[PDB]
Design a protein around this nucleic acid. Structure first.
Lengths: 101, 271, 46
RNA sequence: GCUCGCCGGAAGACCAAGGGUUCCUGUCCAACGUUAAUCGGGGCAGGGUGAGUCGACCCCUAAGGCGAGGCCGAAAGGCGUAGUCGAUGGGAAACAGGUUAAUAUUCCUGUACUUGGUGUUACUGCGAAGGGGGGACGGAGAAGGCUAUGUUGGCCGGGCGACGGUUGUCCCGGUUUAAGCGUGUAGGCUGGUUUUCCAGGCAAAUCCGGAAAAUCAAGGCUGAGGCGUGAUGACGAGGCACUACGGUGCUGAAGCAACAAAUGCCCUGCUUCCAGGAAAAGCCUCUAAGCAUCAGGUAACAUCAAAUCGUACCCCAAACCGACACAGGUGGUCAGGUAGAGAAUACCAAGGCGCUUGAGAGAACUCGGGUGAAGGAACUAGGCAAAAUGGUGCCGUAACUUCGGGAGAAGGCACGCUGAUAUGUAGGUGAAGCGACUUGCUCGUGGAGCUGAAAUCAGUCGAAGAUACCAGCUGGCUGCAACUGUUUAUUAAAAACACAGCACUGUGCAAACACGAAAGUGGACGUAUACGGUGUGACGCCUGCCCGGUGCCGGAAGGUUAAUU
RNA sequence: AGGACCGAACCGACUAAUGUUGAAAAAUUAGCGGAUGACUUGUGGCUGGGGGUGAAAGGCCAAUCAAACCGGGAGAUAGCU
């Protein structure tokens, strides 16, 4: 019994990335971005309830954000600024025999 | 006995070993061991307080019964064995209610001998009695200074004290240093002298033999610089001063005992 | 040859980290000085 | 792409630490790259890290840290008890194949395993911050049994030679297969089973310890490897549809034996020595308070859960530490062939590289090397440097000596290849056969097959047979220091320091002494055969005289003499 | 058996040459010493400046040592340049 709101917050976006398309069409696993604090049980329950599919297992990894740098014209001067992208969590969800999207 | 090593190499030329064939070769009795971690001469401030200490072979502490309070229970010596912590050998004994203990091994003790503690014990070596029950003139070891505290005098390899007189509630002992001490007669002592008397005869033979006993090298003060030690420098070998400690106190003769609390017990200072 | 900086994260944190600074009043004074200067990185705890 | 060269106990491969996207792909060449650059560890964009079993977290503890109360201390604070943290150590379980441009013990295929929760059934004494076992431990040495692994043969597939020959005892390649489950043998340790009793394990125990008696030693723990299964599976040289021929895709033979083997495993063993070789938990067991046809425990089955974080990449280096894409530094793991004692050395394999300025010329001079007539230390402060010696076996070897040494003293001789002894010997291994048995992971016998020195005789080639690489110069007389060792990181490695030994001296334990305004700690869980200080410095023969001076030790009659009154 | 012997890894640093605005703020090359021990090494820990540690050289204590480094007294003082 994970509450509804938790589930409605965990699933952020499907991750299209070639390795994801191949995974979908070969191993019947979808690949999707999840809240960085989501656990495997949360992702399982959320996918099952919100996509009405039956899932086998969830694998998760944490992607560390890259550094990109670019300029900002604040103050008239184009100052070169650098910063870190945000870390995110990637979930490999193995469906049993269904299909959603 | 003492055996001289054949000079097959320098460092073996001068080593004299003392080998005891009856020492138990095997693991010590586990329930009476505990770890005894080394200190390197450092105190809780982390400073060297005693110099020339460090390294050596790892050793475990054997809990030796220095009190001998099992009164009226005969015990049989199970076996003699080596103790890294002492110059003397220890004996594992079996009180026949089923309890094992470690005691210091007197001179003649061997496996199978019977020992006993108390006021009614017989006068034979290994037995512990209050000093008022022990005949005057007898040699004892492992002597208590305060009743019920445990033995503190004559615990080294071949030491003993002589009960030279009994004055009411006190006895007078000739300590091994030659000092006449007065100790109350209710303290306990074990008859006979301590066992491993051939201990002095060993010759270490080489520097490493001392290093693996836990002794670091001693630099002579006169080899130092004036900032390091009162025996300062001077090119060449120069001394020209009265020998002193590293901290300036004159050694080679100056007395250092200062204890008025206990000096009423010292009927004669050592020679 | 061998140089004086031989990095190790554990020793770095145990010697100069935030909690090591906060343990004693002298380290807390260091932290107060660094806050007063406006230092962006207060300790090595990055 | 074809040649050539270099590494190969590494300049190959996998990690820890550290770094932090450097990884892969597509683009760009300003700056960075010691040159050009289409290339890049550079810019820009996108992608990439998948775990019940690997690691962390976690349970447990070492040195040590912090430390309720506490004890100390002008204040700050110091120490420390209960405790709580702290790995570099101890506690639980996954293997082999396949796959991406980039991840794999993580994905997929096949086959497993561990712990915990909850149920059902069956049988039941359960229950600790307490007791006892166990965990649990050194150095060195020596086998023996094996395996990883290699070599050869057999088998299978292919081949018949750009130049004489090559249908053979010819050439090339392959002959791989795991965890788990079952069996329990080479070895190792230990007598077992009952009954009774009790001054021990703070209590109590049906456990441990101890004492008796009886009866069988014929039992039990441990344990590599082999064998079976896993596996009619996977992999497989190579062929063939397909095809951007990148490469995708489909088939797929043999898949055995002998011998030689580790520094790996049996082995935390065994033997031996002295310098006498962590802790706590997990685990097994015993009960106390407590519970009572409950709860709990054991077993089988079923079911569920095993979260979180790391996982890319470099890692002897161009990603780490040295300001550099720096001739430096950096812990662990792996350890193929031919010679060789070998992890040396030489040439190679797998694999990886040619070191991010090159092209000519062929002066002096400098650097690194090769060779030199005749001489041979005449050089020079000095044989500095170079040259030289260099292996194995045997013979032989002086003074001196502490009897061990000196000593590889010095100095000699024999070393290649071929054939016989012997179509391959001594030795090692050891099949089949036949026998036993307490009957297969059995014994005895047997010798097939395999491997295989060393020697001797005879012959033979060259100037030379330890042919390369590799690899002691030797002897004589002396100073110093006994010796091995240590030191001026970065001009001094010594005769200096240390040292075993010796002496003096202090110290009776709340020891002297040291660190601390203290508490306390070290000395030491030691106790005069001990500990501290000082000098000398193995060993041998010895260490003479002086106490006036200065110190130290002892004494106290007298002189002088502080606070105080 | 051995602070035994010869000799690689490993740990050193005796000689020479090169280098000396270096490949390098101490190295390279050829030799050299120890190599089962008073050995060597990884990860942690402890000792703090008149202090530590030191097989002792005034050695080492972050390329700094007859008294570290940072901040402060501080614009010390300078009959000298």
């Amino acid at each position: 019994m994970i509450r509804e709101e938790r589930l409605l917050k965990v699933l952020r976006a499907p991750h299209v990335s070639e390795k994801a398309s191949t995974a979908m069409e070969k191993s019947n696993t979808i690949v999707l971005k999840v809240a960085k604090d989501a656990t495997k049980a949360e992702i399982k329950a959320a996918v099952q309830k919100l996509f009405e599919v039956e899932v086998e297992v969830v694998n998760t990894l944490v992607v560390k954000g890259k550094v990109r740098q670019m300029t900002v014209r604040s103050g008239g001067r184009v100052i070169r600024t650098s910063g870190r992208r945000s870390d995110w969590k990637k979930a490999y969800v193995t469906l049993k025999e269904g299909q959603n999207l | 006995a003492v055996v001289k090593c054949k000079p097959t190499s320098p460092g073996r030329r001068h080593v004299v070993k003392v080998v005891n064939p009856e020492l138990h070769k095997g693991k010590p009795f586990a329930p009476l061991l505990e770890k005894n971690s080394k200190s390197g001469g450092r105190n809780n401030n982390g400073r060297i307080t005693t110099r020339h200490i460090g390294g050596g072979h790892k050793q475990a502490y054997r809990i030796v019964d220095f009190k001998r309070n099992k009164d009226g229970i005969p015990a049989v010596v199970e076996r003699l064995e080596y103790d890294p912590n002492r110059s003397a050998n220890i004996a594992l004994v079996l009180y026949k209610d089923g309890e094992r203990r470690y005691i210091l091994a007197p001179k003649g003790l061997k496996a199978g001998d019977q020992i006993q503690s108390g006021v009614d014990a017989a006068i034979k070596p290994g037995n512990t009695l209050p000093m008022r029950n022990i005949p005057v003139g007898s040699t004892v070891h492992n002597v208590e200074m305060k009743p019920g505290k445990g033995g503190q005098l004559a615990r080294s390899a071949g030491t003993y004290v002589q009960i030279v007189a009994r004055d009411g509630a006190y006895v007078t002992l000739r300590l091994r240093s030659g000092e006449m001490r007065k100790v109350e007669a209710d303290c306990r002592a074990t008859l006979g002298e301590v066992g491993n008397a051939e201990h002095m005869l060993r010759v270490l033979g080489k520097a490493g033999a001392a290093r693996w006993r836990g002794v670091r090298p001693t630099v002579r003060g006169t080899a130092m610089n004036p900032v390091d030690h009162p025996h300062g420098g001077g090119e060449g070998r120069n001394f020209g001063k009265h020998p002193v400690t590293p901290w300036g106190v004159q050694t080679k003769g100056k007395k250092t005992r200062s204890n008025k609390r206990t000096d009423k017990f010292i009927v004669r200072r050592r020679s | 040859m061998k140089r004086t900086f031989q990095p190790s994260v554990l020793k770095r944190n145990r010697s100069h980290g935030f909690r090591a600074r906060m343990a004693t009043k002298n380290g807390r004074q260091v932290l107060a000085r660094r806050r007063a200067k406006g230092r962006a990185r207060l300790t090595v705890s990055k």
